[PDB]
Symmetry: D3
Subunit: 216 residues, 6 copies
């Protein structure tokens, strides 16, 4: 099924609890949480203890995206913080396969993500292991960036592979997703759509999420 995942990176950091409540008013089923350490990407967003704090105020799926170097050192912390899905970059560790096994052994769903410049082939050795494949549609680091349509080719490629192997993991897109681009993402083969800046620039979060469902 098609899932909408509002990115909390675009919300009011001084009131996470009320922002989480606003999201739960919509029909979105996921909350996308961007962890940035200043190493993998230039800036620092927030870490596991912040996620743990958010956990107590939400019943949605915590879709954690780790834009940090050496993510395996945080598997235990995110499991304790209540992360439902942990998505890590093939570019952030020399042992992506083992890192993914670690996530699953910890009881969470395992997600793998690749940057716009990383070839889809970096995903092939991991298909039989992951629960989600995230294709970045903007270069990681911040919200409000321009959608990169070329990345949709990798979405198609992975969807084709999933079929050929008879696998069933979700395919997510993240970056520049809005009412004008989400349709292209769906057609390419994605079923999970992350949206930050677009959704949070509206006061009526419920209607904004609906503009995406309608665009679909």
């Amino acid at each position: 099924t098609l899932k909408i995942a509002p990115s909390i990176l675009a919300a009011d950091y001084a009131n996470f609890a009320s922002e989480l409540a606003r999201i739960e008013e919509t029909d979105a089923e996921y909350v996308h949480i961007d962890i940035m350490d200043g190493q993998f990407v230039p800036n620092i967003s927030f870490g596991a203890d912040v996620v743990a704090s958010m956990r107590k105020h939400s019943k949605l799926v915590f879709d954690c995206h780790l834009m940090v170097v050496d993510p395996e050192r945080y598997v235990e912390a995110f499991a304790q913080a209540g992360a439902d899905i942990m998505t890590i970059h093939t570019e952030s560790t020399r042992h992506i396969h083992g890192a993914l096994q670690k996530i699953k052994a910890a009881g969470m769903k395992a997600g793998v993500v690749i940057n716009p410049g990383t070839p889809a082939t970096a995903l092939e050795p991991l298909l039989d292991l992951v629960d989600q494949v995230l294709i970045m549609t903007v270069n990681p680091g911040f919200g409000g960036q321009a959608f990169i349509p070329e990345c949709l080719e990798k979405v198609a490629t992975v969807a084709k592979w999933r079929d050929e192997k008879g696998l069933s993991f979700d395919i997510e897109v993240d970056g520049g997703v809005d009412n004008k681009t989400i349709r292209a993402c769906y057609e390419a083969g994605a079923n999970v759509f992350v949206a930050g800046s677009y959704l949070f620039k509206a006061s009526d979060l419920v209607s904004q999420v609906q503009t995406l469902r309608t665009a679909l």
Copy 2:
């Protein structure tokens, strides 16, 4: 020479920074200590510049930002833009602590320098003339609730003495394990700014809990 209390937001409810900041403004505290951690200088990641920027519009207190991150100089503009009033950086986090401090000052913020418990006081000697604040960690950086390290007070006395000899006037701050039973010693050692997280936020009545510190002094 005035005594200031700096509640550490790291020990507060992260899901409600706004109300937590409002609680602090109810007390007589003049500073809000903000711990920035990047998973590199210390094991964990707390929050960054954009979170500070969000907090900024819900507080009129002094934003005493403490950067427990590697190569802090790259974040000077970000925190200036975020509304940080003081930027305190670790001598252990860069090979160019002097220039880094100059960058903070030129950016319009007050410059603070901090050293870990294992770092000798002499690491601060070459920086005395350019800082507005010297922070002596009294616990090993990383998290709250750790045991106070008395030996670190020797360094507070040492810096206070250097401040006098050179006739300087920067504030001397302590951070970690600061509570009603340890704050007096910090004061006697020569510190005038006291950061406190766990001891304060574990209490429901913050204004009252902050007063226990004032009284203890």
Copy 3:
């Protein structure tokens, strides 16, 4: 293509390397697989070149050195002098895998290249013409006793296919979770060199234990 067994000393009794090597020599194993770990490429530190140098006098077998260390090129000369016969390095451990392999050959050693489970077989393509051995990890590097990763055999087939297309003849090795129940599958996929640690050394009679692999190979 000669089928070879390479007991991994990582699973042996570190307090008696000479003795353990003697036990290997009683078997029909042709290689001794030596895992060098530096605490950077993988979490643990095993042993270095000087330890390999000390083991050299107590064995007549092929020293198949596997470097799970960052920037392996800095150790080429050390291992050559320690007596390593094959030096196998990770594509993930250096930005210059091609040059690193050239350096191993220039030092008079056989050059091997290895890729982790999560690394695509294409990482191997530009290196086929220069190596003497291709190692496909069948467990994520780090330690023994791990579960075999079947999907990795897909990469063994792919490389064997490429080797055939280019008319090359390098050995194809597998390492990790190789035992009597998985070794045949490694063979059928295209491998001819099998590294085994925990499965072999958990047995007091190394000779019969190595034979069980030979039998499982059924070839």
Copy 4:
């Protein structure tokens, strides 16, 4: 259009001005400038300020090749130094796509390069935004190295991809390119040829460059 790009790394560093003049005497349209930081490769060559100083002594295309880690931090410096082309390594950053965008956004032509051991696949997601694809024919680091013919396989695969995508970026080769190897580079699909030692070992640069064009036939 076939272009020759003399590599200044093989020239008299004590006289860049005169060496650049010697190049302008030939019919070479590019000046290949290798930037090395001692990290991506073992040696340090020269940086942006050197290129900036060279700028006014040449009217040719400054084809800058960055053999440094985290090249994005230098985009602005090279743009301001007068670089015409900025070619960066897929192996030098975890965000090659964004780095290329930064280059283009700064007004320079964007080039991407891969080492002999890096598969051509690393290039696929970047074909749309580059003005040049450089296939190293020697392991980066220094001149006089032996040509690696296997790398030409990647020159052909990219040429094919370019054709299949209706794209039109140049394809460059660099390393061990001489009068005996250039023809093969061309037949493989390359149209821009970097040459260091083969050209500068000669006293008559104009004649030496001509031997290369003659070799192309």
Copy 5:
């Protein structure tokens, strides 16, 4: 006050750690000095915790582990389980030497701190209260058979003085270039624990070779 001899297993026969440990137990040496090198803090890799663990059952002596590795804190648990009795770490190997020492003690082992030849004795002052041993390198870490560095004795003296003034009782160890001709000066400087590698293992009779040190003392 108690003079102890610590043969360094780095100079022994690696292919026979068990028999080498037995040879040591034939002497009156009370410590086995175990050098852990990771190729990062120093150029070479020696052996790790698993090798130490394997050695544990073959010796009843004190395992005096010296970690020449970066970020040693990550190995405290491993060495504790390996049977290490003493864990000595370099101030130059972590930004949090104080907490690192605390972690060693919290794991049930004796905590030691060491400084390279080029590191000033003042780096030890903040740590005098929590250590059980202070190791002063008398050669630059990396390997054995190096030339003794007399100058380092000044730091042994400085620390023996501080121990006196503070009334502490930690051991003072020296390591590197210690033989029958240098051990005396080490002792005079204030050291009581002497690590010896090449000078001891170069002899067939380990029992009498250790005696030459006792007599030299």
Copy 6:
């Protein structure tokens, strides 16, 4: 004896040959060469091969200052390039002592330098080993920066130690040294003065170096 060391970092890079010629026309005895790798400091200047080509164009003392991480890997390279003195930062390696021994074993004069923020205590165990101690008077990176007076307190500390130990190494200063600041540097105890922007900003280099000789 007092020495003047013009910094080639401030010269015209496209004509190193002619620039060195200008320096040789003055009575300056050293040519200060700043090696930057983009790691120790943010920029890259030039390496050992550049120095190598500079060697035959000068009979002066090549005083190479390495603002690079892990300088020991370059000892052999600079010894071959013709460096006469090799000065390294205590903040650039965990083994400053052995690094200095290496420089001497290589047949070069060993020099050690500390950043403005680095305490003089860092030099304490290195005095018996060096031929030169350099105290930065500006934060390393580039020329034209403001002189940092407080650093002279360190020039004085080392001078004092030198005497108490009866050693005879040179004491150099670098950064912000001009006709106005050089006098203080001398009174602080330094005897070797590096100057870049102040010297090269003038067409008559011979007289500019004399303005420093006079100010002394």
